[PDB]
């Protein structure tokens, strides 16, 4: 029995409190350093110039911020897309002045979530189950990559990525609306439909299952105590739930193969989020949503406003104000 | 014929006649008489085998070409032309381009090595003319198991089989390589060191200067 073997075995063991696996060798150190740097920076990071115009923005708790206003400000616009690790700066203070911690945290977080997907698959393989949970987890990973990496790549600067904070997230969303018209993009519509449908189906499935629960408890005891871990029979009556659902809407319209029902539950939000991440990715290369500006014209030629023109008005209001000092020329290219 | 995998070889090419008997013989001139072509010291006696005579031919060529390879690298790399001549830099170390080295060197040393290989082939014929039966590449005493010179060959018959394989293969591959190097240098007017070392480098046109950074 060699040493390598022994190791490989401990690593791929399924009796450890938390599964390590080979993807864990990438997930654990990377996520740990990302979270350590994030926690330190959220508390004591000095201000950073983000637009590269020597106007630093404070985002740390010790610099007069609260939980909502605080954020990890993305790297400077002067750097752009350039790689900026610690050792390329002449001093740590300068590294902090140009927003290096944002790059560090975001790159490590992306590697960590990819390794997290891999580790999910690896444990699925070890336990002898069907290996497609990480496919479902791919959708949030794709969304995070689009918002943190793909959009800066398309725009050409890391300063365009989503800042790690609440108010920073809202600022990113508003500027995205102004410069890109996300709402009128069919992929954002698909994503909103997917999220609303996911909530709808979650609530309805939970209500239907809990409503039809076999009576195996008193009244002075939590209904949840009727079920025992490791049961052999279904604690709920599918027949009653399907009868209620069919009578509610229609007989034909109803799922019976609970397997098909759960597959649909998995399918709806996942495809919605995939389509949304594709909206963000496509719009990172300036393929914006529909522009129905001045589409309606009367006989003479005068323009009649629609509801889209008021959206354009709000977009103009946001646009002429964002990054007030950064621009020097009429067009935002 | 596995060498020429989807093809047939000579109606009588052998598999054990020579170690290199994978069957590669497309035109397979082995079939042809391969005798004392234009009276090549005809014997009509043992006369080896016509295939075995072609085998001795390949052996001589590959051995000479193998030595030729090292004589195309060591003049440049290994020993950097240790010509160390008492005088006369030309015809000595200086010409590291092998073609130009031949262009310079006086006929003194040319006749030296000419008479050297001349005595070599004289002894080879002296053996082979009598060494019938198995001509065995006119082996005679040259490093044979009897080892007519120092460290008289001390190996095993299975090791001898592997050694025959080693020699034959290296000779064939070197017969390729000598062609390589020669056409290389002639069609570049240089020595192998020249093209290979600028290759493994970075061109002077682009070097990103140096790290003159603060």
């Amino acid at each position: 029995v060699s040493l390598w073997e022994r190791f490989c075995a401990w690593i791929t063991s399924t009796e450890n409190r938390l599964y390590i696996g080979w993807f864990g060798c990438l997930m654990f150190p990377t996520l740990l350093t990302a979270t350590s740097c994030f926690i330190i920076a959220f508390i004591a990071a000095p201000p950073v110039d983000i637009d590269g115009i020597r106007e630093p923005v404070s985002g740390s708790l010790l610099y007069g911020n609260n939980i909502i206003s605080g954020a990890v400000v993305p790297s400077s616009n002067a750097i752009g897309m350039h790689f900026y690790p610690i050792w390329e700066a002449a001093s740590v203070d300068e590294w902090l002045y140009n927003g290096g911690p944002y790059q560090l945290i975001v790159l490590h977080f992306l590697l960590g979530v990819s390794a997290y997907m891999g580790r999910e698959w690896e444990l699925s393989y070890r336990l002898g189950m069907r290996p497609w949970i990480f496919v479902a987890f791919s959708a949030p990973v794709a969304a995070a990559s689009a918002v943190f990496l793909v959009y800066p790549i398309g725009q050409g600067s890391f300063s365009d990525g989503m800042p790690l904070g609440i108010s920073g997230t809202f600022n990113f969303m508003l500027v995205f609306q102004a410069e890109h018209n996300i709402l009128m993009h069919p992929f954002h519509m698909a994503g909103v439909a997917g999220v609303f449908g996911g909530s709808l189906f979650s609530a309805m499935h939970g209500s239907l299952v809990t409503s039809s629960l076999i009576r195996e408890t008193t009244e002075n005891e939590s209904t949840n105590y009727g079920y025992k871990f490791g049961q052999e029979e279904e604690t709920y009556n599918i027949v009653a739930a399907h009868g209620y659902f069919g009578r509610l809407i229609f007989q034909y319209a109803s799922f019976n193969n609970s397997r098909a029902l759960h597959f649909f539950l998995a399918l709806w939000p996942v495809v919605g989020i995939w389509i949304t991440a594709m909206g963000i990715s496509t719009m990172a290369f300036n393929l914006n949503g529909f522009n129905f500006n001045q589409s309606v014209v009367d006989s003479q030629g005068r323009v009649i406003n629609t509801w889209a023109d008021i959206l354009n008005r709000a977009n103009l209001g946001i646009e002429v104000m964002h990054e007030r000092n950064a621009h020097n020329f009429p067009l935002d290219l | 014929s596995p060498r020429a995998l989807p093809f047939g070889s000579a109606p009588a090419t052998l598999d054990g006649s020579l170690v290199g008997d994978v069957g590669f013989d497309p035109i397979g001139f082995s079939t042809a008489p391969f005798a004392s072509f234009n009276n090549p010291l005809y014997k009509e006696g043992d006369f080896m085998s016509d295939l075995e005579w072609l085998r001795e031919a390949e052996l001589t060529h590959g051995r000479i070409a193998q030595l030729a390879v090292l004589g195309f690298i060591w003049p440049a790399l290994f020993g950097t032309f240790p010509g160390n001549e008492n005088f006369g830099g030309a015809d000595a170390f200086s010409y590291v381009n092998p073609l130009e080295a031949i262009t310079h060197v006086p006929d003194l040393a040319i006749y030296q090595i000419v008479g050297g290989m001349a005595w070599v082939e004289y002894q080879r014929v002296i053996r082979i003319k009598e060494q019938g039966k198995n001509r065995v590449s006119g082996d005679i005493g040259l490093g044979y198991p009897g080892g007519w010179n120092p460290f008289n060959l001390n190996y095993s018959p299975e090791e001898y089989a592997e050694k025959q394989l080693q020699e034959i293969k290296h000779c064939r591959l070197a017969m390729i390589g000598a062609f390589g190097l020669f056409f290389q240098a002639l069609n570049s007017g240089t020595d192998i060191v020249s093209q290979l070392s600028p290759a493994f480098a970075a061109p002077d046109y682009a070097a990103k200067a140096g790290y003159f950074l603060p």
């Binding site: 040493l3 390598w4 190791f7 790689f83 390329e88 | 790290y211």
Partner: protein
């Protein structure tokens, strides 16, 4: 930074030291796997033979 660079080695020390980690791994891996030439399983992703 933007200086192209083969891999990203700028100082011979950096390459000569990113070396021993990979070679250490190669050695520990060779410790289990050594003197292996044959044992063709000829099956769909079996590799049962150690």
């Amino acid at each position: 930074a933007r200086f192209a660079n083969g891999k990203p080695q700028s100082i011979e020390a950096k390459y000569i030291m990113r070396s021993p980690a990979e070679w250490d791994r190669f050695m520990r891996f060779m410790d289990r796997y050594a003197e292996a030439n044959g044992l063709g399983f000829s099956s769909x992703x079996x590799x049962x033979x150690x």
